[PDB]
Amino acid sequence: AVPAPNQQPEVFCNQIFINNEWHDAVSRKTFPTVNPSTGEVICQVAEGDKEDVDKAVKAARAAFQLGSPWRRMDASHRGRLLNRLADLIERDRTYLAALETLDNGKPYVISYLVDLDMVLKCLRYYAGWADKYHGKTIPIDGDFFSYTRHEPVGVCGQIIPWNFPLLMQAWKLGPALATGNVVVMKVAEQTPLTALYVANLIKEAGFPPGVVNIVPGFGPTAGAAIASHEDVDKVAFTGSTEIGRVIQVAAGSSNLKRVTLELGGKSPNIIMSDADMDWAVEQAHFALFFNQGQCCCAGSRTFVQEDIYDEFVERSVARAKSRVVGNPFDSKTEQGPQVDETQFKKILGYINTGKQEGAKLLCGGGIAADRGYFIQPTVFGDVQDGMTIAKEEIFGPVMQILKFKTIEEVVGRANNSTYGLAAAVFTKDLDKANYLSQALQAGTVWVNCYDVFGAQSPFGGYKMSGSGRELGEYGLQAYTEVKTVTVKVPQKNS
Amino acid sequence: AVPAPNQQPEVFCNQIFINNEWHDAVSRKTFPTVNPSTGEVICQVAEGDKEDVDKAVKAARAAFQLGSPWRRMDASHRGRLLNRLADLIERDRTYLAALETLDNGKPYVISYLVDLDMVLKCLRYYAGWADKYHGKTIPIDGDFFSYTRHEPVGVCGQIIPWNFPLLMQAWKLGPALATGNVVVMKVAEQTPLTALYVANLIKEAGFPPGVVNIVPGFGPTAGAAIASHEDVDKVAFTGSTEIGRVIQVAAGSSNLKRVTLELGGKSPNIIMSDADMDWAVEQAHFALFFNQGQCCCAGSRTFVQEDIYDEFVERSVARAKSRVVGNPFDSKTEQGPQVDETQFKKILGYINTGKQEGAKLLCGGGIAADRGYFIQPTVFGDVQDGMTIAKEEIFGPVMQILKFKTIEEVVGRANNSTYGLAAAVFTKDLDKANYLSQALQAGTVWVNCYDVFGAQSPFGGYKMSGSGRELGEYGLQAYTEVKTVTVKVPQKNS
Amino acid sequence: AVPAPNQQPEVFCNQIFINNEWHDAVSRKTFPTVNPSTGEVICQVAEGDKEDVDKAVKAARAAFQLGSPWRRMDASHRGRLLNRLADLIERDRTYLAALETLDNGKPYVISYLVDLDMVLKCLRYYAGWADKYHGKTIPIDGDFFSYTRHEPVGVCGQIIPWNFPLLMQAWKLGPALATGNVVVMKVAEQTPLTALYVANLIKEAGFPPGVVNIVPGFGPTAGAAIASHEDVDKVAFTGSTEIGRVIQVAAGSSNLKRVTLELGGKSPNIIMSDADMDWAVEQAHFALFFNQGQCCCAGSRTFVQEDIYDEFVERSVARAKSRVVGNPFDSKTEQGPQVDETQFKKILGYINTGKQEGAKLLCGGGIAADRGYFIQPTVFGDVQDGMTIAKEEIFGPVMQILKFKTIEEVVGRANNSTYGLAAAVFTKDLDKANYLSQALQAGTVWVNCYDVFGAQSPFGGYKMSGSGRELGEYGLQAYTEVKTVTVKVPQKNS
Amino acid sequence: AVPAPNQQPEVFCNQIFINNEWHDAVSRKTFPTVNPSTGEVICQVAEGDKEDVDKAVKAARAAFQLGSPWRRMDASHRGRLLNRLADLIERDRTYLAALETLDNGKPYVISYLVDLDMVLKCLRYYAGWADKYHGKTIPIDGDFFSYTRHEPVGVCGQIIPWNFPLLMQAWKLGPALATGNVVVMKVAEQTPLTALYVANLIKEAGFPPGVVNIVPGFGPTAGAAIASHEDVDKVAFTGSTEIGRVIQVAAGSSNLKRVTLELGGKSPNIIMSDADMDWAVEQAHFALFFNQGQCCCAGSRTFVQEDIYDEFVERSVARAKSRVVGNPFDSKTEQGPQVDETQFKKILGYINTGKQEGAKLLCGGGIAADRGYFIQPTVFGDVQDGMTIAKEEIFGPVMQILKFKTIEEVVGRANNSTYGLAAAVFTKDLDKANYLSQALQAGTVWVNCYDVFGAQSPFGGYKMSGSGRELGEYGLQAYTEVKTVTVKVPQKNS
Ligand code: NA
Ligand code: NA
Ligand code: NA
Ligand code: NA
Numbered sequence A, B, C, D: 001a002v003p004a005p006n007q008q009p010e011v012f013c014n015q016i017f018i019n020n021e022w023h024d025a026v027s028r029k030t031f032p033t034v035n036p037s038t039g040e041v042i043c044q045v046a047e048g049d050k051e052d053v054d055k056a057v058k059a060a061r062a063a064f065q066l067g068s069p070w071r072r073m074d075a076s077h078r079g080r081l082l083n084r085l086a087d088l089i090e091r092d093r094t095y096l097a098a099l100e101t102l103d104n105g106k107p108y109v110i111s112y113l114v115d116l117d118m119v120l121k122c123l124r125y126y127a128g129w130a131d132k133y134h135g136k137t138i139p140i141d142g143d144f145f146s147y148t149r150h151e152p153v154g155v156c157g158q159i160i161p162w163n164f165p166l167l168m169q170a171w172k173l174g175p176a177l178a179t180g181n182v183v184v185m186k187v188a189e190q191t192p193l194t195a196l197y198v199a200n201l202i203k204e205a206g207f208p209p210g211v212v213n214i215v216p217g218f219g220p221t222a223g224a225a226i227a228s229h230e231d232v233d234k235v236a237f238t239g240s241t242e243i244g245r246v247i248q249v250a251a252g253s254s255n256l257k258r259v260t261l262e263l264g265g266k267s268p269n270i271i272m273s274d275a276d277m278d279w280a281v282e283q284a285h286f287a288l289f290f291n292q293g294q295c296c297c298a299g300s301r302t303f304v305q306e307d308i309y310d311e312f313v314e315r316s317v318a319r320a321k322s323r324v325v326g327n328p329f330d331s332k333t334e335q336g337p338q339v340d341e342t343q344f345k346k347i348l349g350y351i352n353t354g355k356q357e358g359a360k361l362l363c364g365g366g367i368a369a370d371r372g373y374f375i376q377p378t379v380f381g382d383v384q385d386g387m388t389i390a391k392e393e394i395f396g397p398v399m400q401i402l403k404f405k406t407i408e409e410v411v412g413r414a415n416n417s418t419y420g421l422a423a424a425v426f427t428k429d430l431d432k433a434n435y436l437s438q439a440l441q442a443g444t445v446w447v448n449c450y451d452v453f454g455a456q457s458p459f460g461g462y463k464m465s466g467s468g469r470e471l472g473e474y475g476l477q478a479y480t481e482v483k484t485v486t487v488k489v490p491q492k493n494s
Helices: A050-063 A075-091 A093-104 A108-127 A165-178 A193-204 A219-228 A241-253 A277-293 A309-322 A341-357 A407-415 A430-439 A473-479 B050-063 B075-091 B093-104 B108-129 B165-178 B193-205 B219-228 B241-253 B277-293 B306-322 B341-356 B407-415 B430-439 B474-479 C050-064 C075-091 C093-104 C108-129 C165-178 C193-205 C219-227 C241-253 C277-293 C309-321 C341-356 C407-415 C430-439 C473-479 D050-063 D075-091 D093-104 D108-127 D165-178 D193-205 D219-228 D241-253 D277-293 D306-322 D341-356 D407-415 D430-439 D473-479
Strands: A016-018 A021-023 A030-035 A040-046 A135-138 A144-152 A155-159 A182-186 A212-214 A234-238 A258-262 A268-271 A301-305 A360-363 A378-381 A398-404 A422-426 A444-447 A480-488 B016-018 B021-023 B030-035 B040-046 B135-138 B144-152 B155-159 B182-186 B212-214 B234-238 B258-262 B268-271 B301-305 B360-363 B378-381 B398-404 B422-426 B444-447 B480-488 C016-018 C021-023 C030-034 C041-046 C135-138 C144-152 C155-159 C182-186 C212-214 C234-238 C258-262 C268-271 C301-305 C360-363 C378-381 C398-404 C422-426 C444-447 C480-488 D016-018 D021-023 D030-035 D040-046 D135-138 D144-152 D155-159 D182-186 D212-214 D234-238 D258-262 D268-271 D301-305 D360-363 D378-381 D398-404 D422-426 D444-447 D480-488
Touching: A016 A050, A016 A193, A030 A093, A040 A193, A050 A155, A050 A182, A050 A212, A050 A219, A075 A093, A075 A108, A075 A165, A075 A193, A075 C108, A093 A108, A093 A165, A093 A193, A108 A165, A108 C075, A135 B144, A144 B135, A155 A165, A155 A219, A165 A182, A165 A193, A165 A234, A165 A473, A182 A219, A193 A212, A219 A234, A219 A241, A234 A241, A234 A473, A241 A258, A241 D241, A268 A277, A268 A407, A277 A301, A277 A309, A277 A398, A277 A422, A301 A309, A301 A407, A309 A360, A309 A378, A309 A398, A341 A398, A398 A407, A407 A430, A422 A430, A430 A444, A430 B430, A430 D480, A473 A480, B016 B050, B016 B193, B030 B093, B040 B193, B050 B155, B050 B182, B050 B212, B050 B219, B075 B093, B075 B108, B075 B165, B075 B193, B075 D108, B093 B108, B093 B165, B093 B193, B108 B165, B108 D075, B155 B165, B155 B219, B165 B182, B165 B193, B165 B234, B165 B474, B182 B219, B193 B212, B219 B234, B219 B241, B234 B241, B234 B474, B241 B258, B241 C241, B268 B277, B268 B407, B277 B301, B277 B306, B277 B398, B277 B422, B301 B306, B301 B407, B306 B360, B306 B378, B306 B398, B341 B398, B398 B407, B407 B430, B422 B430, B430 B444, B430 C480, B474 B480, C016 C050, C041 C193, C050 C155, C050 C182, C050 C212, C050 C219, C075 C093, C075 C108, C075 C165, C075 C193, C093 C108, C093 C165, C093 C193, C108 C165, C108 C473, C135 D144, C144 D135, C155 C165, C155 C219, C165 C182, C165 C193, C165 C234, C165 C473, C182 C219, C193 C212, C219 C234, C219 C241, C234 C241, C234 C473, C241 C258, C268 C277, C268 C407, C277 C301, C277 C309, C277 C398, C277 C422, C301 C309, C301 C407, C309 C360, C309 C378, C309 C398, C341 C398, C398 C407, C407 C430, C422 C430, C430 C444, C430 D430, C473 C480, D016 D050, D030 D093, D040 D193, D050 D155, D050 D182, D050 D212, D050 D219, D075 D093, D075 D108, D075 D165, D075 D193, D093 D108, D093 D165, D093 D193, D108 D165, D155 D165, D155 D219, D165 D182, D165 D193, D165 D234, D165 D473, D182 D219, D193 D212, D219 D234, D219 D241, D234 D241, D234 D473, D241 D258, D268 D277, D268 D407, D277 D301, D277 D306, D277 D398, D277 D422, D301 D306, D301 D407, D306 D360, D306 D378, D306 D398, D341 D398, D398 D407, D407 D430, D422 D430, D430 D444, D473 D480
Parallel strands: A155 A182, A155 A234, A182 A212, A234 A258, A268 A301, A268 A422, A301 A398, A378 A398, A422 A444, A444 D480, A480 D444, B155 B182, B155 B234, B182 B212, B234 B258, B268 B301, B268 B422, B301 B398, B378 B398, B422 B444, B444 C480, B480 C444, C155 C182, C155 C234, C182 C212, C234 C258, C268 C301, C268 C422, C301 C398, C378 C398, C422 C444, D155 D182, D155 D234, D182 D212, D234 D258, D268 D301, D268 D422, D301 D398, D378 D398, D422 D444
Antiparallel strands: A016 A021, A016 A212, A030 A040, A135 A144, A135 B135, A144 A480, A360 A378, B016 B021, B016 B212, B030 B040, B135 B144, B144 B480, B360 B378, C016 C021, C016 C212, C030 C041, C135 C144, C135 D135, C144 C480, C360 C378, D016 D021, D016 D212, D030 D040, D135 D144, D144 D480, D360 D378
């Protein structure tokens, strides 16, 4: 049930968004954003830098001042605004989905039915949280009345990646706005278009000027300025584990701003011998290949018990070979192109790395088309723990299938990683499910499923996959600053 | 390692407890409490009535007055007092265990390792809640500061049964005292001794006079007076569904006091064909025969899938036949006598009904000794849903085994009851486990286990098995009165 | 900025609402609903009795069956439906506000700006709660995984009054529908029209058939049938303290259904000598006269500190003498007619009683118009605690002003009541405010304000003013049935 | 009632605590700890370095392994252990209070009645949290069962200061141990003795080996070793804002461990003209001079409304001049010496600067004794915001009194700081209290009181005074790692 797409949507926003208005970079510089399916330039976008970040931060700080419209506004009204933003996004759903695909490369059907659906659900969920994150009245010792106020953390710098442009924007804005914070957001240079159009909707929804400011540009410039800014109270970064370290260092070198990170992974998908074969094979395929393999929690280590290995691999290879690669605007297309040339080459390198390491190439392993950044669904068999393709995040359509014998063994191998974002277990046994879900050191453990995200369930990593949680009630903690008020009273009574 | 018992523990307390003092009934009347193992009178106990209840309520009301030691006391200190009471109970553990057995009939080993261990864990668990049940600061619309105060509900009338004398006392005192309430407790005429001794430990612990008042006596007199009292704010009753109805009506007919009930049940224990036979058989036995079958959540309807029915029944009969009945102070004894003559005769009557209606008597069926209220471990097979023994709570060592074919069938049959206190599922399959735990209309659903109680987890019934929950955080709800305080402020800000 | 009202709005709904269909009463009997401003009959309404309630309960039970559209529906979608309902009600705001005024008598401007605004805020508030009322994962002892499911209580009987027809309906449906329950609502015979039209919007919004069934009729018939029904799981009642007892007795006499009550009061509004005179006088006026004085938490006992007594009374009389009484559809009207003849006469009786017992009549005291049920704003000075008008709920435009000297004194006099729905304190002093808000035995204590309701803050009474709380997160407690699921695991670890 | 102290308590522990055993530093080096009251060496303490920290981390990691005694231990038992530890500390209360005074310098009476009392209260409070920090069951979309496990964060590195040796240790251990984490603690080189003795009690209490590890030593060595360790999962640092930045940079440069900081401040104590003069004078004195002015939240900026300035200052000066400085073991002593020579000199430097910049020296201003690190109670009047002594944390007995006129003025001047740990407001006015408590940007706002700490109320700073909160329920957040488990089920129902 998908409406026909406009395969060449018009672009209306390509500037810096500050105080509900559009601005060119101070430098007047602009950068081209490319269509990964064709390798052609879509349009040019204002290149924000430190001076532009400074302007955004000031606007946000001004909007956060005591007595301002955003500060005085009823919590419930913040809820009304988020719900209005969601309605506007829904009104322009067909357009946003098409634009999302044009700039990112993912199939339009997926942008429409998945990405935008989750954006709506995310904003609508958080709109409901606006006036329900209560503080506490505390039974402190002595003749006192003690309580806590859950106040907004303040100016929040949010940096989002390119794999899920609109969704990542929603995951950030939802909890921050619901709790009354102000935002300075840095969108990915590879996919700035959809986020900038949403800014138009933010103004249309009635949000006071300066509550949400978006600055497109690059990381070493715009992103770094936000992380090192002396007046940004909190920063939330989603991207690579490498840059996450840069962000936290910047925060510690500046004003000690609160930090939360959502980084990458090398998530283990464990297939026990008693699992439903047909379901496990389809879910394992989805777990890895979804969104051109460009998912932080991709099931990149498919552990399969030795007794069902041969069959599982045979079916996985057949599924990989049938996966249609092509024009994301074509309904038959399952896999579009990678996001850009840099990623395209990085994946080709990892594919060659696997071949050099001795991993058995079962299918694919090369370029899928001459134009664009298309890579053939690739499957590696007999992968070993010590192999690079088994340790490092590839972020592409490259599957690793490993073999194991016992349940105690797989736990140790699954946990033997610096990453710990997600994990999965496929089994029909009650005990094995509980044994594994408890033992796996990962932020999310899916049982008989994969990539099941709910705005109400927290998401985040263990170890170096990140810190802090997004989504759910937990997603509000990082956007709250706690204040204790302890008042002397004549005589405290229970 | 169970310390040797004093098979004839001396009785030190047998009067009405009010304001930390011992009083005879105003009428000066006394009733005998019998040792169910011999049928001989242990001692005489003060027979409280309306006038005695009136004295206790006034004492409790006085102790609840604003500015009183109990009202002004720091919440954290209430916890210290609760832990102190627990330490005193642990000091007198062997004595209380022996006294529990003497008056109740349950095996001394069980009173020691089970009942008293749970009493200590319950009291210590609630001690920790004392200063942690926070109220809220609410982000209401307009220029206001709104918050809630979690105040004690007040004078709490608590009526407890005879199956777990010390434990039921703890389940009531823990939450009530942890939240700063005052208590007027009515203990069972069949088992008043142990609770009265605890009242002495409550005084030794240092609880202010009037905080806990215990009035031994009969139901139609002392209990009814509590339920109809115009100055009792909340009543908590544990007993038969029949009397539960009397309690709610009395509350409505009097001062509209808050009510919570923990009533009977006809809990189904469902054994799927893929269950572990040895474990399922042993757990099904415990599920029904525990504490002389005198448990509210007893698995009195053992549903077994047809493919394993014959074998399950065989093993169950063998286990029941090996069950050692005898002197509760004997370490070999698994089963002591029933609480009294009334119960003794009720059970024999139910066994008779089982025979008349065509249920297959597989073992037991009669008296187990010439002295004492001892009944043989009885097992009925081929029981049908329409049989009296399949519908009514027997509260004795009488096992009902029913046969079923499908999972859909057993859900309907298990839920076809006015009761809904507990239920269990024995299976190795993840889906079946989750399907059943969700579908079963019961307060507690145990998977691959039975009678697993934790002070942390709530317990209570669905339908006519009661209302409200005891234990866990939920256990505090019925003992809290919420007050909203909304203050006008110069100008509200987030 | 209120839209011009249609002073004679057409009635589209006047039958029984079951399974999203309109039905005549089984007996075919109807009853007249009158316009209290003219005394003329508006239209006939189906008179539901026990047989109709039975039909409604069966429809609700069917809609609640496991696997039904309402049970399988995502919690978030329930929120979506509640928001859709609010949107439909907002679309027909002017119509509903006029119809509310026609049937109830309250000023149109108030219906539009206050009642409907609050209805919209209540429904939208709870829409956000639909997927956020989490159960718990509990760290129980032993090798077990214990958790709780917050399930719907089931078929909920809801009986609402005539003072705030639409608002009371929202307070009930909001929390019930957000938690997934099904409803059988009984509306007041005096104001059934608006609630029936809303039922038409519930059908339009997309709620499955049977989820909400409305049965108009009388109390001793339809109301009692609900309270005594064997298949109703929970009953929520709002009305007199007298009928509240009937409801609780009916529940205990039937299936032991869960009960919550919102009854009346005689709320004390305490004015300390350091209070802002102008503010306190106006708020005290609003505190009593709001909604023709037909408010459960009306400040019917105005305590004024002796040093400012004379001036306060002086200003209060001047305010009561200038209060405009007249046609509710005229923008100048502050006070419309009382709901019906029974109330009209009852209020005149209280005024006569006040004069008989020595209260000083300062203004008003009689009929305000020859047509309709209009009463003059009446003020009584020098009222004493023992006077009838100082103890009984009048539910009319009759103000009681009492004089006091000390703060300790007023606390005792304020708390010397069987009621405890609400109270207020007017003072500039921090300690006095904290001292009084703590000491006052009332469900809601307002400081320097009155009648400040927020969908985020709980409302309910102490003592005989009721039990349980509505609004806020607390409003969800009574609509949830807790189930503990304790699963045996191989080896539990923290 | 303070027991006679042993003015020269013996030292029994002076080594590195690993796996419940006492070790010498790998290098065999030791460092002296001085008695600030005499400047003499108490004893030598093992000087821990990177190699010693590595050993501790390994021991902690081992004790944290899945299946270990600490991981398998019931949550309730962790509470039993914390309570047992508290009982042992109470048993050795007199000894510890004396040792604390010997190593730190604070008055014995204070160490006994305040520090140890709070230590006991902190451990007992958190003992109650051990089995009550529930995860959640989440109503996610689709046919899934989603829930969260609150798991321990893992190996926690904790670095505490010298101002409140025993209390700071308790603040760290309480929440960490209650949640099941393992600890590697670095104590202050100036006050390592008491913490080391408590380690003996930790072993005596029954805590498994490796659960708590204490490495005495220096910050640039041991401290940096902890913050930079690749296997430490979380770090909590309390001390100067300067070192705090080093800690967050180290964390981001290493393994992205989770961090929380409790740094310094320059907390404003606002005295409004309507404040209780006597109470405000005594509380303002306590606000600054408590613990030799060595408190992170010291009210080092005393703002006094012009109308009462002269009188307030006069009484303040008289109070400061009567403050008894001397031997901490003498019951007459109010102020002992400063912790060490470094602080002693730094404070004298600040007093010199105060005189240099124009602040009016009202009393004291120099050394109070020729032996030890005693400084006279110093009061500076007419201090201006730009002055160094009004901006920098002195951490000594130096009081700054500023004059102001309006409430808007004081808010801005109070908030014009990089710090935001605490604040106080002294006023009898309700509106003034609410206005100020909301507007002030500080972690804790005391009204009509100061330094009111409750184990149940959170404490932490805004801006650069730190991040995260300690104490109360909030203190558990930083020691918890959230894991979402999403399970596919046959058919989801509410
Ligand atoms: Na996979
Ligand atoms: Na007995
Ligand atoms: Na039984
Ligand atoms: Na009417």
